[PDB]
């Protein structure tokens, strides 16, 4: 049984557990055991929770940030359903009471014992919340569809729970002996050394003696910093390059081991290739020992030298600048450091940036202020997670402050908290403990944590860290491990099926290619693997029976698969589809869609609903991911083709979109579609401007039959080819109800763009803090300060609300000027 679990994890994580043992590392071995225990302890607490508390794990409530409606309800062991006229203000218990009141008349005779399951979905309806607050009910009101729910008893939820069971005395300066190398290049070679505490230096960078292109230096390189002054999170960064400048390779390492002891003596560093000094990069060597260039160094002995315990550390014009700074200004903040904790605790970040980390006595005083520092708000704590604040206790302080995070707020920032793991120095950290703990406390969190980690196993620098985390998770959840295995098996067949489609497309016609996709899918192994799975894009969405006859592929370069599903239990709710893309990177798209999804949350938090389409996007592997099918939608280009035999026969190209909406929304339905279009058009106008999405043609802009506009293929963001505001004549025509002159509908639309832009500006720091944590991701279009600077300009944070709104009106008028 124990062997089975081991081999099952290996396949799921895509890296055999034998590999972890084959390294024979104490850090790897200590992580695996300490975390297994923590995960198994968390699995035990889960097995004793109540049936309602279990639902909070297995099926977390999807909640939104008077008027009666028709609702259909049925029981578990029957087909007979009941239709009720219940209000939006009604609690699920009142609906549960109605279901038991209409059962007592049919069966001829307590709501607290039940839970309402969503038909063919891993979503539930429970708690003291009105029906209209539920995301499932809320969607059914706008679309007009009838909600289908199932009455599930406490004993059946408990049946699910059971079947799912498992020192300062060192005044000498710092030095290293740069022995030899084992590189290959074609000139002289220099080795640059630097001591770092985050993004900034501890002492000036020292270069080596110029040696010709297997080189031997054998030189002791000294640094302008004492051994006793060296902070706990001190990083020794190297850069091997060639000069007559050409970068070859880079390599960094911690001065203290995971056991806090200062490192001595000999070390072989397997260097990572280059594009000069990179402090952000990993502290572990290139696992390609076969072809990786080595850097042999010696750490001169001082004798055990463990870093001092916290008890030893603890024993040892102002307001105007508080809204990059001069030296006198930095001294001022360090001078009145006690007054900062008392009156401005939220300014901790600026105080942590001015402290001299290269002076151990300044660090001790700072840590004493930190150990009595009151809990920072989630927002302020998100800034502390950045590489700018590397200290272990500072990292611990951020986690401690982030513990107040809701499962809904954590789901919005999970991607950033996963990418921040790349900044980490040691395997066992306060972040991983938090990420694993929250994952084993909420199944939806654990689902996305796994997928964010898995999709990056192909990246060698994070393959060891992520593989170890996923292993620990599977110890804490054996059932979910088997659930995610079904998802991994489905994605395996999809890659093979797509590989055939890519070959076939270059050899024969699409009708014959599509027919041989169906033949490949209708095979037992394909049929079984591609069916009855939780959607990796959303665990609550169940992809049951695969609708092979409706499966096709897209005509774009990498031939993306179009996989449709069907459900008996759900009906129309189970008529969901997925897109399997292979060959392109879906990381930027995921990022852009999460940023757009947040804007929509922040708009709904101020009352405004701009009818945004936050369709799922998830990279699942090596240039491989999934995209959620937006049903009953089409591109501007496919709508504007003005093809014959169709109900939308337009005379002018501007009338194409409006005529399309006329056939899809008749008479009194068209009026709703225009407002749906106008709000989404306004929503995406601000979103694309703020995020800086360029090259927006008719092929990457889509419309829903409801009128709703959305954007696809986010290939280039942050104006990385500055981009202006975009307005199309075809859209203004739809907004103005199909009239050449209608200022009333245009000014009401101009009001939506203004309201949306002003809201975002207030949360402008939130977008900055998250995009800065996303610099860790290694995205080619988000790697420097000039990328982050785009938002500070597009949102205009430095200016006031009156100046920023006026400057926005300047950009909006230029978009209408460019509009023919
Ligand atoms: C009908 N219909 N619907 C959609 C569609 C729906 N929801 C989506 N989320 C996407 C999408 C999103 C992002 C990317 C990307 N990351 O680039 C790609 C696609 N597309 N597409 C088609 C069309 C189609 C043609 C042939 C076969 C199948 C379909 C007519 C174009």
| CATH code assigned at 441 | 1.25.40.70
Q: What is the resolution of this structure in A?
A: 2.8
* Strands 294-298 and 200-201, bridge-based pairing: unpaired
State both tokens at 399: 């986690």
Residue nearest to atom 22 of ligand 1 (CA): 634
Rounded distance from Cα 586 to ligand 1 centre (Å): 15
- Residue with token string 């996923």: 470
**CA–centroid distance, residue 676 to ligand 1 (Å):** 20
Three-state secondary-structure class, residue 194: strand
Other beta carbons less than 10 A from residue 293's beta carbon: 20
280 and 209 belong to one structural domain? yes
Ligand 1 center from residue 704 Cα (angstroms): 12
Instruction: Single out the residue of 437, 431, 442, 440 nearest to residue 407, CA to CA.
Output: 442
Which residues, other chains included, contact 474 with Cβ-Cβ below 8 Å and sequence gap of 6+?
5, 8, 9, 12, 13, 480, 481
**Ligand 1 atom 21 nearest Cα:** 634
Q: Same domain, yes or no, for 237 and 316?
A: no
- Ligand 1, closest atom to CA 560? 18
The answer to whether residues 317 and 429 belong to one domain is: yes
Ligand 1 centroid vs 649 CA: distance in angstroms? 23
Cβ partners under 8 Å of residue 669, min gap 6: none
Same domain, 329 and 463: yes
The rounded Cα 294 to chain-centroid distance in angstroms is 35
Atom of ligand 1 nearest to the CA of 700: 17
Atom of ligand 1 nearest to the CA of 638: 30
Same domain for 359 and 237? Answer: no
Alpha-helical (H) ranges within 605-655 are 636-639
Q: Burial-class residue 375 by CB neighbours within 10 Å (0-12, 13-18, 19+).
A: middle
Ligand 1 centroid – CA 377 distance (Å)? 40
Residue 354 and residue 477 in one domain? yes
Are the C-beta atoms of residues 535 and 578 closer than 8 Å to each other?
Answer: yes
Q: How far apart are CA 124 and CA 146, in angstroms?
A: 16
455 with 323, same domain: the answer is: yes
Please report the atom of ligand 1 found closest to the CA of residue 562.
28
Determine the Cα angle at 511 with ends 508 and 516, to 5°. Answer: 75
488 Cα to the center of ligand 1, angstroms? 23
Q: What is the distance between the alpha carbons of residues 614 and 602, in angstroms, rounded to a whole number?
A: 14
Same domain? 392 vs 247:
no
CB 767 within 8 A of CB 775: no
Q: Which of 749, 716, 718, 721 is nearest to 816 (CA)?
A: 749
- The rounded Å distance from CA 746 to ligand 1 centre is 30
CB 89 within 8 A of CB 132: yes
Q: Which domain holds residue 269?
A: 173-298
Residues with CB under 6 A from ligand 1: 552, 554, 562, 579, 589, 615, 627-630, 633-635, 638, 712-713
Residue 759 makes CB contacts below 8 A (sequence gap 6+) with: 602, 603, 606, 608
Indicate whether 287 and 421 sit together in one domain: no
Q: How far is the CA of 483 from the centre of ligand 1 (A)?
A: 27
Instruction: Spell out the residues 6+ positions from residue 181 whose beta carbon is closer than 8 angstroms to its own.
Output: 189, 214, 215, 216, 217, 240, 293, 294, 295, 296
CATH number of the CATH domain containing 260: 2.60.40.150
Judgement on whether residues 314 and 292 belong to the same structural domain of the protein = no
Nearest atom, ligand 1, residue 630 CA: 7
Mutate to test the pocket of ligand 1, among 556, 561, 577, 579 (most ligand atoms within 8 A of CB): 579
Cβ within 8 Å of residue 614, ≥6 positions away: 593, 596, 597, 600
Strand, coil or helix: what is 297?
strand
Is the domain of 277 the same as that of 331?
no
386 and 409 housed in the same domain: yes
Q: How far apart are CA 270 and CA 179, in angstroms?
A: 14
Atom index in ligand 1 nearest the CA of residue 617 equals 16
Of 559, 577, 612, 633, best ligand 1 pocket probe by most atoms within 8 Å of the beta carbon: 633
Scanning the structure block, which residue is given the tokens 């005379």?
651
For ligand 1, atom 15, which residue shows the shortest CA distance? Answer: 713
Q: Cα of 514 to ligand 1 centre, how many Å?
A: 16
Spacing, Cα 629 to ligand 1 middle (Å): 7
């Amino acid at each position: 049984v124990k062997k089975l679990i081991n081999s099952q994890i290996s396949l799921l994580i895509g890296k055999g557990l034998h590999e972890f043992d084959s390294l024979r590392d104490p850090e790897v071995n200590d992580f695996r055991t300490k975390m297994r225990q923590f995960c198994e302890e968390a699995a035990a607490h889960r097995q004793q929770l109540g049936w309602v508390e279990w639902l909070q794990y297995s099926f977390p409530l999807q909640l939104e940030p008077n008027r009666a409606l028709l609702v259909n309800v049925k029981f578990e062991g029957s087909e007979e359903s009941f239709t009720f006229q219940v209000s939006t203000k009604d609690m699920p218990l009142a609906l549960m009471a109605c279901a038991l009141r209409k059962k007592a008349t049919v069966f001829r005779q307590q709501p607290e014992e039940y839970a309402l399951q969503v038909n063919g979905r891993h979503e539930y309806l429970y708690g003291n919340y009105p029906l209209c607050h539920f995301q499932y009910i809320c969607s059914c009101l706008h679309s007009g569809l009838t909600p289908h729910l199932t009455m599930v008893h406490s004993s059946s939820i408990l049946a699910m729970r059971d079947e799912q069971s498992n020192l300062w005395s060192l005044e000498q300066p710092f030095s290293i002996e740069l022995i030899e190398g084992r590189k290959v290049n074609a000139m002289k070679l220099v080795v640059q050394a630097g001591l770092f505490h985050g993004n900034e230096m501890l002492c000036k960078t020292v270069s080596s003696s110029e040696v010709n292109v297997e080189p031997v230096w054998k030189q002791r390189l000294e640094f302008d910093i004492s051994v006793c002054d060296l902070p706990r999170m001190a990083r020794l960064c190297f850069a091997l390059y060639a000069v007559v400048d050409c970068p070859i390779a880079w390599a960094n390492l911690m001065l203290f081991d995971y056991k806090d002891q200062l490192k001595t003596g000999e070390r072989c560093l397997y260097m990572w290739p280059s594009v000069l000094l990179n402090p952000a990069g990993t502290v572990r060597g290139n696992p390609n020992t076969e072809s990786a260039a080595a850097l042999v160094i010696y750490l001169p002995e001082v004798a055990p030298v463990y870093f001092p315990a916290l008890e030893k550390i603890l024993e040892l014009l102002r307001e105007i600048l508080e809204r990059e700074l001069y030296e006198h200004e930095k001294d001022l903040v360090w001078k009145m450091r006690h007054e900062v904790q008392e009156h401005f605790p939220e300014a901790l970040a600026r105080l942590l940036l001015v402290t001299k980390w290269n002076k151990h006595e300044d660090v001790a005083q700072m840590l004493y202020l930190l150990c009595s520092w009151p809990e920072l708000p989630v927002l302020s704590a998100l800034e502390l997670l950045d590489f700018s604040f590397p200290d272990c206790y500072v990292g611990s302080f951020a986690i401690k402050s982030l513990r107040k995070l809701t499962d809904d707020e954590l789901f919005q920032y999970l991607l950033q908290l996963v990418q921040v793991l790349k900044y980490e120095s040691y395997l066992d950290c306060e972040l991983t403990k938090f990420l694993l703990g929250r994952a084993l406390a909420n199944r939806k969190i654990g689902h996305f944590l796994f997928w964010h980690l898995r999709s990056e196993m192909h990246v060698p620098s994070v393959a060891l860290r992520f593989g170890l985390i996923m292993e620990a998770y599977c110890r804490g959840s054996t059932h979910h491990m088997k659930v995610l295995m079904k998802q991994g098996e489905a994605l395996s067949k999809l890659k093979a099926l797509n590989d055939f489609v890519k070959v076939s497309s270059q050899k024969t016609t699409k009708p014959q290619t599509k027919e041989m996709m169906h033949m490949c899918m209708r095979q037992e192994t394909y049929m079984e693997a591609l069916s009855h799975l939780q959607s990796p894009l959303d665990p609550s969405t169940l992809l049951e029976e695969v609708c092979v006859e409706q499966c096709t592929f897209m005509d774009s370069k990498m031939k993306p698969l179009w996989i449709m599903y069907s459900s008996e239990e759900a009906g129309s709710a189970g008529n969901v589809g997925i897109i399997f893309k292979n060959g392109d990177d879906l990381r930027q798209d995921m990022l852009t869609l999460q940023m757009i999804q947040l804007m929509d949350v922040l708009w709904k938090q101020e009352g405004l609903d701009l009818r945004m389409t936050p369709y799922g996007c998830l990279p699942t592997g090596d240039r491989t991911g999934l995209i959620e099918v937006v049903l009953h939608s089409d591109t501007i280009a496919n709508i504007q083709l003005n093809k014959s035999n169709m109900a939308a026969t337009a005379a002018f190209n501007k009338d194409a979109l409006l005529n399309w909406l006329k056939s899809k929304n008749p008479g009194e339905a068209l009026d709703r579609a225009i407002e749906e279009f106008t709000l989404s058009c306004a929503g995406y106008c601000v979103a694309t401007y703020v995020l800086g999405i360029g090259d927006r043609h008719s092929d990457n802009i889509m419309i829903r039959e409801s009128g709703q506009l959305f954007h696809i293929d986010f290939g280039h963001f942050l104006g990385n080819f500055r981009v202006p505001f975009i307005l199309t004549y075809d859209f203004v025509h739809v907004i103005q109800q199909g009239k050449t002159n209608n200022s009333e509908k245009f000014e009401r639309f101009r009001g939506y763009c203004e309201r949306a832009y002003t809201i975002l500006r207030r949360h402008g720091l939130l977008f900055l803090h998250l995009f800065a944590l996303m610099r860790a991701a290694g995205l080619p279009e988000l790697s420097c300060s000039k990328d982050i600077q785009y938002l500070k300009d597009s949102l205009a944070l430095g200016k006031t609300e009156e100046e920023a709104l006026k400057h926005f009106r300047v950009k909006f008028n230029e978009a209408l000027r460019e509009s023919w």
